[PDB]
Design a protein around this ligand. Sequence first.
Ligand SMILES: *[C@@H]1O[C@H](CO)[C@@H](O[C@@H]2O[C@H](CO)[C@@H](O[C@@H]3O[C@H](CO[C@H]4O[C@H](CO)[C@@H](O)[C@H](O)[C@@H]4O)[C@@H](O)[C@H](O[C@H]4O[C@H](CO)[C@@H](O)[C@H](O)[C@@H]4O[C@H]4O[C@H](CO)[C@@H](O)[C@H](O)[C@@H]4O[C@H]4O[C@H](CO)[C@@H](O)[C@H](O)[C@@H]4O)[C@@H]3O)[C@H](O)[C@H]2NC(C)=O)[C@H](O)[C@H]1NC(C)=O
Ligand SMILES: *[C@@H]1O[C@H](CO)[C@@H](O[C@@H]2O[C@H](CO)[C@@H](O[C@@H]3O[C@H](CO)[C@@H](O)[C@H](O)[C@@H]3O)[C@H](O)[C@H]2NC(C)=O)[C@H](O)[C@H]1NC(C)=O
Ligand SMILES: *[C@@H]1O[C@H](CO)[C@@H](O[C@@H]2O[C@H](CO)[C@@H](O[C@@H]3O[C@H](CO)[C@@H](O)[C@H](O)[C@@H]3O)[C@H](O)[C@H]2NC(C)=O)[C@H](O)[C@H]1NC(C)=O
Ligand SMILES: *[C@@H]1O[C@H](CO)[C@@H](O[C@@H]2O[C@H](CO)[C@@H](O)[C@H](O)[C@H]2NC(C)=O)[C@H](O)[C@H]1NC(C)=O
Ligand SMILES: *[C@@H]1O[C@H](CO)[C@@H](O[C@@H]2O[C@H](CO)[C@@H](O)[C@H](O)[C@H]2NC(C)=O)[C@H](O)[C@H]1NC(C)=O
Ligand SMILES: *[C@@H]1O[C@H](CO)[C@@H](O[C@@H]2O[C@H](CO)[C@@H](O)[C@H](O)[C@H]2NC(C)=O)[C@H](O)[C@H]1NC(C)=O
Ligand SMILES: *[C@@H]1O[C@H](CO)[C@@H](O[C@@H]2O[C@H](CO)[C@@H](O)[C@H](O)[C@H]2NC(C)=O)[C@H](O)[C@H]1NC(C)=O
Lengths: 38, 52, 127, 97, 110, 50
Amino acid sequence: NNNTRKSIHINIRQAHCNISKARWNETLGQIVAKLEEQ
Amino acid sequence: NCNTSVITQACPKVSFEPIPIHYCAPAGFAILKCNSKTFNGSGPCTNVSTVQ
Amino acid sequence: QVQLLESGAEVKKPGSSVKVSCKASGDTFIRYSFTWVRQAPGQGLEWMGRIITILDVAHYAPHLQGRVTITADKSTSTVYLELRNLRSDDTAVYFCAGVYEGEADEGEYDNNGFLKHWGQGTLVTVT
Amino acid sequence: KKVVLGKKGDTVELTCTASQKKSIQFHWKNSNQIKILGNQGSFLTKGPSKLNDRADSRRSLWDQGNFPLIIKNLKIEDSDTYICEVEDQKEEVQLLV
Amino acid sequence: ELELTQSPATLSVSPGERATLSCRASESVSSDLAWYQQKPGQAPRLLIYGASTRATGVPARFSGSGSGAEFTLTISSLQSEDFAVYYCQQYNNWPPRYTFGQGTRLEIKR
Amino acid sequence: QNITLQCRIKQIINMWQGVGKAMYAPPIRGQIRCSSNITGLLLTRDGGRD
Ligand SMILES: *[C@@H]1O[C@H](CO)[C@@H](O[C@@H]2O[C@H](CO)[C@@H](O[C@@H]3O[C@H](CO[C@H]4O[C@H](CO)[C@@H](O)[C@H](O)[C@@H]4O)[C@@H](O)[C@H](O[C@H]4O[C@H](CO)[C@@H](O)[C@H](O)[C@@H]4O[C@H]4O[C@H](CO)[C@@H](O)[C@H](O)[C@@H]4O[C@H]4O[C@H](CO)[C@@H](O)[C@H](O)[C@@H]4O)[C@@H]3O)[C@H](O)[C@H]2NC(C)=O)[C@H](O)[C@H]1NC(C)=O
Ligand SMILES: *[C@@H]1O[C@H](CO)[C@@H](O[C@@H]2O[C@H](CO)[C@@H](O[C@@H]3O[C@H](CO)[C@@H](O)[C@H](O)[C@@H]3O)[C@H](O)[C@H]2NC(C)=O)[C@H](O)[C@H]1NC(C)=O
Ligand SMILES: *[C@@H]1O[C@H](CO)[C@@H](O[C@@H]2O[C@H](CO)[C@@H](O[C@@H]3O[C@H](CO)[C@@H](O)[C@H](O)[C@@H]3O)[C@H](O)[C@H]2NC(C)=O)[C@H](O)[C@H]1NC(C)=O
Ligand SMILES: *[C@@H]1O[C@H](CO)[C@@H](O[C@@H]2O[C@H](CO)[C@@H](O)[C@H](O)[C@H]2NC(C)=O)[C@H](O)[C@H]1NC(C)=O
Ligand SMILES: *[C@@H]1O[C@H](CO)[C@@H](O[C@@H]2O[C@H](CO)[C@@H](O)[C@H](O)[C@H]2NC(C)=O)[C@H](O)[C@H]1NC(C)=O
Ligand SMILES: *[C@@H]1O[C@H](CO)[C@@H](O[C@@H]2O[C@H](CO)[C@@H](O)[C@H](O)[C@H]2NC(C)=O)[C@H](O)[C@H]1NC(C)=O
Ligand SMILES: *[C@@H]1O[C@H](CO)[C@@H](O[C@@H]2O[C@H](CO)[C@@H](O)[C@H](O)[C@H]2NC(C)=O)[C@H](O)[C@H]1NC(C)=O
């Protein structure tokens, strides 16, 4: 909440997502290691 | 000749949260499950079990 | 944001068709919806209908659809109100109005009905 | 090989056909096997090619088994052989701009 | 569909007086009732967006609120330039079946 | 240490179930939370003679 702007010129649709940086890079490192097998 | 079909419907909001759904075999049928680890999607499984 | 420029007055024998135009300027036509209002003399603001320019769809007041259609010509940024089988009952001053919608092009359309941008009013009569 | 002609600045429609009319997955590729376009579910995907900002398709015809590659604003550099990948079918067309 | 009605047909006030205009909704419209100001020869320009937000360009004199079947519009320190016909509009319809009330005319007391 | 993605909520969307578009009503007022588990990815390979 506290996102009530409707227009810029003549924010209710603004949202965001959090991912742990350390999990994501670890996850990719494992994926990459498997891609390298092919 | 192409055209469109438009339907105007009521727009209620609803709660929407996916629930796990299990599929079960009908009488006369059975489901074979591949229990090999790292099956990879195709080809033989050497560990097969039967479930409903 | 925009100004709306309308066509002039017209008179037709009953049963004839009349087409009223409303040109929008100062924004992208596609970005937002337009409506029509019928100011019959001595009356209030009768609603004629609504047209959405992001999705080419329209809705009409329930007693009028047998005679009226609305067209959004995206290439000329112009909305046309067509009155078929014109009756003397339809004598009125007609006009368009625009409603700003946010980023309709990006699919963030609000579907607002609040009328901020207005035309001038064109009298349509019969003879 | 089918041959389709056009000139610089024109628009051309090249097509693949699926007789079953089931709006199946399909792809278009160039001669170097670079993906140009395809059908993901009901969505149109544009691949990383030179046609990425010019290629299009009439989605409404996918239900008729018609899966066109529409190339807007043709340049002489676009005169390649385009490959259809539909199920097993491999139609090929040479475009001469 | 929903019928909107004005309470007064007209309202006679003195300049500087607070106008108190109102509109009723037979189907309990919810936060979907807008207010417009129409002067003779003019388009019925929007005053209040939704039930209570004054539209950009609208003087601070104009305010209003309401819910369900009853909504109001008031004009603080009413000026001579505000002796217009005020209209009530409802949007709680899908498919659209938008309507307007009859319009309340302010009269200058003389 | 937090990767933040910017997201938008849209009303006019394409349908996954078939060719066509659909319009949905404007977003609910607020405090909308979607906590979820990434369990896999869908990737495509970009190869070629190049
Ligand atoms: C992967 O799996 C995970 C789970 O394993 C999925 O995550 C789930 O995603 C759900 C998405 O909707 C999310 O659901 C929301 O949870 C909120 C919190 O729940 C808690 O409180 C309720 C209270 O009864 C308990 O029952 C519950 O057990 C929890 O304790 C709910 O509040 C949300 O409901 C509200 O929003 C929905 C929108 O559709 C409304 O339909 C619903 O009626 C509720 O609406 C209220 O809030 C809105 C906010 O703008 C108001 O506008 C509206 O008027 C209502 O507000 C009134 O009531 C609130 C109540 O506090 C009050 O504050 C306010 O002032 C008003 O009075 C909704 O239920 C799941 O929680 C979430 N699970 C977890 C564990 O996080 C995940 O999505 C899956 N992945 C994918 C991709 O699907
Ligand atoms: C072939 O696949 C089956 C299915 O996964 C494997 O059998 C499973 O082996 C595990 C570990 O031995 C069993 O788990 C244990 O179950 C008992 C039940 O009470 C529980 O107490 C233990 O803590 C543990 O969870 C699992 O139940 C068993 N599944 C079945 C259906 O028997 C099997 O080993 C695989 N064979 C080969 C050669 O890999
Ligand atoms: C990455 O994102 C997560 C999720 O937002 C961050 O964790 C959050 O950190 C805030 C810091 O204030 C926590 O708020 C506190 O919560 C306690 C709970 O009772 C409350 O008492 C405090 O007054 C305060 O509100 C928040 O709860 C926490 N979220 C979760 C799920 O624990 C995290 O810090 C971010 N990491 C980085 C590097 O920014
Ligand atoms: C997502 O992670 C970001 C990481 O920056 C969070 O933003 C921070 O929240 C902490 C909370 O104490 C603030 O101190 C930081 O200043 C914030 N950073 C910035 C750049 O503003 C954000 O709130 C998280 N969002 C969600 C949904 O959890
Ligand atoms: C997403 O939210 C969950 C909780 O809903 C976070 O997991 C919790 O993080 C706190 C941090 O102090 C731990 O104490 C909890 O035990 C955690 N809960 C669980 C179930 O593990 C999670 O880290 C958040 N994710 C991101 C990327 O911010
Ligand atoms: C992993 O996938 C590959 C193919 O993607 C499977 O490969 C088959 O292996 C058998 C073993 O004799 C060969 O006879 C087949 O010709 C292979 N298929 C192909 C397309 O080459 C492989 O068996 C899979 N691993 C499993 C099921 O554990
Ligand atoms: C996301 O993954 C976590 C970790 O596996 C899941 O949380 C666990 O769910 C099991 C189910 O029996 C519980 O026994 C564990 O205690 C849970 N862990 C924690 C820390 O609470 C979580 O439910 C997953 N979320 C989704 C949406 O699947």
